[PDB]
């Protein structure tokens, strides 16, 4: 299983990835990933239980969520893997990512509606069902609510942080995890969600297929951090209320721990790390 930079996919691989995503949507499976994510967004809080977000388990949680989604894609087409979007490099609305043969482009200015690509509402193939904003069409406003995607220099400063995470293990923390997540500092992962806009800026952000490519690159950055800091590892390592410690299991699966997810190579490799 090799996760490739989206920019490098062949036309055949783009076609097959799109078709596999649209089949998970058609069969009803896709929308339950949107629902799960929103349930965790809404329940993960800085002063109580927190598992998928604003906590050390942000990274292994999204790694296991993306694996569940990749395995569902592979149950439709075994050749498909999740690509990643290096937003530090492919940073404009002209990136091939946003072309009509892949994810389609930005939304029109009146109502944010995406008008091209396979996920445009007009195709009839991408109803937005799990939602808060009552509109049922995919929306985006690339670069509308924040002017720029992170740069490579910004990513490198976060990558340079040696501690995985620090007490109080939440959105106030210093350390790598919270700087990558983006609640402190120059802001990597949260800013990308804000930059895409539309559903990607909300708790039902997996409604946009770019969600997966965004988190696959966040996931790659955790792998690169590990290569940079082989002396550093997941914390906390035991007895922390409300936070998933290294060897504690994670909801919703209950059968996997951060410890089981630290090494991505047990599940996939990258085109280049």
């Amino acid at each position: 299983t090799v996760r490739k930079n989206q920019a490098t996919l062949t036309a055949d691989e783009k076609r097959r990835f799109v078709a596999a995503v649209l089949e998970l949507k058609r069969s009803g499976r896709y929308d339950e990933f949107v629902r799960t994510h929103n349930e965790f967004i809404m329940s993960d809080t800085d002063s109580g239980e927190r598992t998928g977000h604003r906590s050390p388990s942000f990274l292994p949680w999204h790694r296991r969520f993306l694996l569940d989604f990749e395995q569902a894609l592979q149950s439709v087409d075994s050749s498909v893997t999740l690509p990643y979007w290096d937003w530090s490099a492919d940073r404009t609305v002209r990136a091939s990512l946003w072309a009509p043969d892949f994810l389609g482009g930005t939304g029109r200015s009146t109502d944010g509606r995406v008008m091209d690509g396979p996920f445009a509402a007009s195709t009839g193939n991408w109803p937005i069902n799990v939602r808060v904003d009552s509109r049922t069409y995919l929306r985006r406003s690339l670069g509308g609510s924040v002017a720029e995607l992170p740069t490579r220099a910004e990513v490198e400063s976060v990558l340079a942080i040696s501690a995985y995470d620090l007490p109080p293990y939440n959105s106030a923390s210093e350390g790598f995890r919270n700087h990558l997540e983006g609640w402190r500092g120059v802001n990597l992962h949260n800013r990308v969600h804000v930059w895409v806009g539309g559903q990607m800026a909300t708790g039902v952000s997996p409604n946009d297929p770019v969600f997966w490519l965004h988190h696959a690159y966040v996931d790659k950055l955790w792998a690169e951090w590990q290569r940079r800091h082989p002396d550093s590892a997941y914390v906390p390592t035991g007895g922390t209320p409300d936070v998933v410690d290294l060897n504690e299991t994670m909801k919703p699966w209950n059968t996997v721990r951060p410890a089981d997810l630290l090494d991505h190579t047990a599940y996939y490799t990258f085109d280049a790390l």
């Binding site: 967004i41 808060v132 992962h189 804000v194 909300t202 708790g203």
Partner: peptide
């Protein structure tokens, strides 16, 4: 809010 959940 849930419709701006990455944007304090």
């Amino acid at each position: 809010s849930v419709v701006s959940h990455y944007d304090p």
